Design an enzyme around this catalytic site. Structure first.
Site, PDB file in Angstrom:
ATOM      1  N   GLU A  35       2.409  94.711  55.321  1.00  0.00           N
ATOM      2  CA  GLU A  35       2.793  94.128  53.976  1.00  0.00           C
ATOM      3  C   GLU A  35       3.962  93.672  53.610  1.00  0.00           C
ATOM      4  O   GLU A  35       4.059  92.681  53.115  1.00  0.00           O
ATOM      5  CB  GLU A  35       2.418  95.427  53.030  1.00  0.00           C
ATOM      6  CG  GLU A  35       0.814  95.648  52.691  1.00  0.00           C
ATOM      7  CD  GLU A  35       0.197  94.512  52.073  1.00  0.00           C
ATOM      8  OE1 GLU A  35       0.888  93.491  51.592  1.00  0.00           O
ATOM      9  OE2 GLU A  35      -0.879  94.667  52.069  1.00  0.00           O
ATOM     10  N   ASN A  46       2.770  85.883  42.797  1.00  0.00           N
ATOM     11  CA  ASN A  46       1.623  85.179  43.176  1.00  0.00           C
ATOM     12  C   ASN A  46       1.319  84.116  41.783  1.00  0.00           C
ATOM     13  O   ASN A  46       1.291  84.502  40.814  1.00  0.00           O
ATOM     14  CB  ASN A  46       0.329  86.303  42.964  1.00  0.00           C
ATOM     15  CG  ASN A  46       0.650  87.330  44.035  1.00  0.00           C
ATOM     16  OD1 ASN A  46       0.566  86.857  44.950  1.00  0.00           O
ATOM     17  ND2 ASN A  46       0.781  88.352  43.750  1.00  0.00           N
ATOM     18  N   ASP A  49      -1.841  83.864  39.610  1.00  0.00           N
ATOM     19  CA  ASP A  49      -2.200  84.655  38.727  1.00  0.00           C
ATOM     20  C   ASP A  49      -1.247  85.184  37.841  1.00  0.00           C
ATOM     21  O   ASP A  49      -1.441  86.212  37.073  1.00  0.00           O
ATOM     22  CB  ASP A  49      -3.359  85.796  39.079  1.00  0.00           C
ATOM     23  CG  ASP A  49      -2.828  87.022  39.697  1.00  0.00           C
ATOM     24  OD1 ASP A  49      -1.579  86.789  40.267  1.00  0.00           O
ATOM     25  OD2 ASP A  49      -3.448  88.032  39.596  1.00  0.00           O
ATOM     26  N   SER A  51       0.861  87.546  38.825  1.00  0.00           N
ATOM     27  CA  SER A  51       1.064  88.946  39.171  1.00  0.00           C
ATOM     28  C   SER A  51       2.149  88.961  39.958  1.00  0.00           C
ATOM     29  O   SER A  51       2.486  88.093  40.831  1.00  0.00           O
ATOM     30  CB  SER A  51      -0.064  89.817  39.672  1.00  0.00           C
ATOM     31  OG  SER A  51      -0.396  89.090  40.788  1.00  0.00           O
ATOM     32  N   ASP A  53       3.753  91.278  43.617  1.00  0.00           N
ATOM     33  CA  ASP A  53       3.592  92.304  44.595  1.00  0.00           C
ATOM     34  C   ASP A  53       4.894  93.076  44.921  1.00  0.00           C
ATOM     35  O   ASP A  53       5.852  92.343  44.916  1.00  0.00           O
ATOM     36  CB  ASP A  53       3.033  92.131  45.815  1.00  0.00           C
ATOM     37  CG  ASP A  53       1.642  91.284  45.640  1.00  0.00           C
ATOM     38  OD1 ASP A  53       1.088  91.713  44.928  1.00  0.00           O
ATOM     39  OD2 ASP A  53       1.449  90.197  46.310  1.00  0.00           O
ATOM     40  N   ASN A  60       0.579  95.752  43.529  1.00  0.00           N
ATOM     41  CA  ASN A  60       0.552  94.548  42.480  1.00  0.00           C
ATOM     42  C   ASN A  60       0.398  95.107  41.155  1.00  0.00           C
ATOM     43  O   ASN A  60      -0.181  96.024  40.779  1.00  0.00           O
ATOM     44  CB  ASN A  60      -0.989  93.847  43.020  1.00  0.00           C
ATOM     45  CG  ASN A  60      -1.142  92.607  41.914  1.00  0.00           C
ATOM     46  OD1 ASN A  60      -1.675  92.626  40.940  1.00  0.00           O
ATOM     47  ND2 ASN A  60      -0.383  91.605  42.414  1.00  0.00           N
TER      48      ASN A  60
END
Length: 130
Positions: A35, A46, A49, A51, A53, A60
């Site tokens: 990750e 991102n 969308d 969002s 992380d 998220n």
């Protein structure tokens, strides 16, 4: 901070991650490696969308933490996403535990499916005293 491998393994063990909801420490280590490269300050927007992380587990903002800027999002970990960017990973671990209380468990993270599932993950904890 960027953890060294074995330091992180012991940190996670002291935080109660070894075997949490059936998930071995080596699986948590493989997740963190892929990750974020063990980096607590890691972030990824991102654009698709809206969002983001956050942190060592790249949790998220749509479902798990609040950043105020993710449309229609919820906050199942009941934390600011800022909490997931601390050097101290206790809050991030509490949130990761929350994630895996849901049905998918460790499969919540696609990187785990891609990089850890059905793999020999022993190397991540070798020599660390865990």
């Amino acid at each position: 901070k960027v953890f060294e491998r074995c330091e992180l393994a012991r940190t996670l063990k002291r935080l109660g991650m070894d075997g949490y909801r059936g998930i071995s420490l080596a699986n948590w280590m493989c997740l963190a490696k892929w990750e974020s490269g063990y980096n607590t300050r890691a972030t990824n927007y991102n654009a698709g969308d809206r969002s983001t992380d956050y942190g060592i587990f790249q949790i998220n903002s749509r479902y798990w933490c609040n950043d105020g800027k993710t449309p229609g999002a919820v906050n199942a970990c009941h934390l600011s996403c800022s909490a997931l960017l601390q050097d101290n990973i206790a809050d991030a671990v509490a949130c990761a535990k929350r994630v895996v209380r849901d049905p998918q468990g460790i499969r919540a993270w696609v990187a785990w499916r891609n990089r850890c599932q059905n793999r020999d993950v022993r190397q991540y904890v070798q020599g660390c005293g865990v």
